[PDB]
Amino acid sequence: SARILVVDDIEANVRLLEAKLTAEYYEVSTAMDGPTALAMAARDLPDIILLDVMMPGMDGFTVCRKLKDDPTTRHIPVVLITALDGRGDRIQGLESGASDFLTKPIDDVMLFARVRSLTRFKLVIDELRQREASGRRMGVIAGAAARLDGLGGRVLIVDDNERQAQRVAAELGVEHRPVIESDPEKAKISAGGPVDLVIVNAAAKNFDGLRFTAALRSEERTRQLPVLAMVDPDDRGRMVKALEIGVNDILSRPIDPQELSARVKTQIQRKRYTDYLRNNLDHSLELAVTDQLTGLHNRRYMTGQLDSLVKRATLGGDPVSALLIDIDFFKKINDTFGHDIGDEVLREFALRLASNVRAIDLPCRYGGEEFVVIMPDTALADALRIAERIRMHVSGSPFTVAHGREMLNVTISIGVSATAGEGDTPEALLKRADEGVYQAKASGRNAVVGKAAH
Template sequence: MSARVLVVDDIEANRKLLCAKLAHEYFQVTTAVDGLDAIDKAIATEPDIILLDVMMPRMDGFEACRELKFDPRTEHIPIVMVTALNEREDRLKGLRAGADDFLTKPINDLQLLSRVRALSKYKLVADELRKREASGRRIGVIDVTPTGRGGNPARVLVVDDNERQAARICRYLETDHKPMTLANAGAKPGGVGAGAATVDIMVLSLGGEKYDGLKLCAYLRNLEATRDLPILAIVGAEDEALAVRALDLGASDILVRPIDPEELLARVKTQVSKKRYIDSLRARLDQSMELAVTDQLTGLHNRRYMENQLEQFMKRANMGGGPVSILLCDLDHFKKVNDGHGHDVGDEVLRQFSDRLMHNIRPSDIACRYGGEEFMVIMPDTTIQMAQLTAERIREKVDGAPFSINNGLGRLDVTMSGGASVTFPPDDSVAQLIKRADEALYNAKENGRNRIVCNFDGF
């Protein structure tokens, strides 16, 4: 998979070397000469990965990393710190600054390419969600961009068939997180998917004798429930090929033994932060989809959703499926409510009516606000006789108790009228179905209101 890579290094020879290695694998490469230049290029070119040297003039890599991760325009871009130093403190400093990974010069080609590919997959998902989120903001159903970086302690599943090693890893993590072993989660390596679906990250030892760590990585990536679960794979210092293979199969990050507790915590924090960012984007998108089909005053489905659902049900009914009935209902004399008590009271009545409507239909029925004080209930697999019973039940619940107004200070009697109709295959249409219900509603209004009339045309 190709990706756009920004290479940042103050030494031209280093930039050329990295560019050549990446271009050979068909990555698109741009370059920057220091931290300040990197920030400008990242904003301008929106790369998929940034390879950021540590020791540079004007602004070093650590400071540039912090700036990039602080800026909402670039915070989602994975950063790999590159340095000639291989000191523990440098790794920790880079990870704490927000780096996603750390490579030491001279750079190993396999490690470089495997990390770039692994991080590109994350960026691809993030970009798609960000585009959808931006579309939601443009049409007004999303108001702010989520960050999702903070949050509660992470639930960490530690998978290691050496119980002592698993317990030690849990002790390292329990200062900041909520770790558990497979035994604590009540699962076995063969059934680890169920346990993994309930946690924020998995710390997986690849050297297990009772299970195949690589196979487990691939398996979890193929499960819907764990497809996006971060996997921090632990390998021995001599297992370079194993680490590279793990990244190719879906591991999110690699930690080399002997385990440094602070590096473990830093890498877990980074992976959990990325997961929560993606989760936050998805949650906002789910919310935006719900808002797009929801009436904001009543919480019922809106007319757009109603029309779409009716079209689907009508097609099914015309092709031999079960009958679909609709109830078109209207609050009687609602204009007097608005004129006599104000629109705030009118809104209170509409919300309470919607609540009574929802509590008196089946889970399979669809309640929608048709417009103003008119509402529709779509009832799949429902005869007109069954629809009449439902409509009468709703009418009785509306007429049976006064509506609370002025925040509970007053009471108001409200009634409703309704017209019901049913599909008439094989050549029925949504427009005809609604017209029949509308005619029945008109008859209910003309004959004294507070009643249900059913249109039996076609019988």
């Protein structure tokens, strides 16, 4: 279910861990030092890396720093597993970018809980990386592939221990924008707003922090919001639960502020990376101008042009008209002959429309079975002629279908609309058009109806 790379200078360690992980059905590979490790990671792109710190030559902190400094590997969670146990070295490991820092001998129940958690989180990151990478024979821009810090960031602190909360707030205060909130019900609201990270106390006295987290996770709006939970280091059952319901990361009471700072930064920086991906995906769709199926222009492109043309109309320029065409009984077509045949009809209809209208006109795909034609410098009466012409052309001739094998009769209903002067707006114009289609429908279909200015 995951490819895990294990790194340690002692063979006994490597194969003991290996047997545990393959017993849980993971695909394990191994390296015996830093240099090797970095080569395998760059080549094989594993899902997780488990890493010794103390090794002859290049040590685990360095290895870790390099993995995060290459864009190919920056995204892979690293878990340090080591014999060291000083606070000093704990903090050095987290500051160098590791998700967790475990001290030998490790708790297997926590290791597997943690691994199952990381893989769950990597699911969405990886899909989005796949989505982007399918722009690669296209055009990227703007983005200079440049990272994205972990500083800044608005942090909500849900806690009913005033002493503890203020300490947490004082530490984050220098580098971040912290806000305290001891009411869980209010907190639910706040957490929807402008917030990058929530810190929740699982050992709160007046509410259950874990239930509160489950709450955030269940509602679609905040399922993605990172959550860092304060827990008791002696209560293993509760730590596993925390990971299982969906907590991104954990901290031991009493709160070490240097540990706190390191993990808050880690979490804010991963959440930003995944919002870079989401926005890049959405910016590239914005740039699309045609409808994939019919190759006519899409409605986004159309409404942009309609904005400009209607504004110019309102301030005294040329009038604009709109035709809104909707195919009759289109659902009956799909329900009888199948979706494929539905698409043959749509494609043919688009080519017929395009070629019975002037080049200066803007025909477009407006919805599933709806088409709009914008006609610059055209008034209501002419538009009605043009609509009539298209109606008679569509129904005057059957449609080829089932690639060649069969004909079909198709008819359309059309609503027609023209601009009405200074007060008019493109949404008003379109609304009059579909009031026309509605009456045309009601009149018995295969009909044109022009609704007038008010």
